């Protein structure tokens, strides 16, 4: 069958529900912290300690 016949390729399955929504919530947390740092260092700033 290595020479005559053939097959078909998909090459992408994970199917892990809890892992998928962990990845989605981690990406949401990353977007939160990224925009947090962005407009944290962008605009008018008052800190918690001195010069955070």
């Amino acid at each position: 069958x290595x020479x005559x016949x053939x097959x078909x390729x998909x090459x992408x399955x994970x199917x892990x529900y809890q892992v998928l929504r962990e990845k989605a919530a981690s990406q949401r947390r990353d977007v939160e912290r990224a925009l947090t740092r962005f407009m944290a260092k962008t605009g008018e700033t008052q800190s918690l300690f001195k010069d955070d």
Binding site: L35, A40, Q46, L48, F49, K50
Partner: protein
Amino acid sequence: ALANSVTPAVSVNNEVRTLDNLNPDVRLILEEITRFLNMEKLLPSYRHTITVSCLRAIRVLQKNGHVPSDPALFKSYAEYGHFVDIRIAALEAVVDYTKVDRSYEELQWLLNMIQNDPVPYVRHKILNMLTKNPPFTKNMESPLCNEALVDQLWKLMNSGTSHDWRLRCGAVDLYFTLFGLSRPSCL
């Protein structure tokens, strides 16, 4: 619930002032309250109630010696052009700050803003929860109300309070709490 994660016993000797970048889960709580404060600065969803809970959390962290006892954030959120709830939470915070810490100057600013602001309800609730949460407690007078604060409170009962009846009613409540059925031990 993050505000109800009171951990008062981290600073054993001096851990208040950016020594450890204080550790280990208090910093994660600071990360989350920073995220929610900046989200409600960007999103805002319904009255900045998340910001009210975050300011209560920041005051609890100031009461546990992690973030140092500095009113300047609460001062900048007791300003005029905000929502009523943000301002009322920052004013509850600075009333409890004047209770615990010995900040006389922010009390002077608080009385001057009792005199000078156009919104009645913030004055109402300043006087209400200043009576509920009193500094300068009767017959426990360490921060020395007798110097000139008795005079200025007597003035604020007499003058500058012809606006509403209830503001001098709250000042009557103030003299109920502060040196009530006696002389104030001045002369």
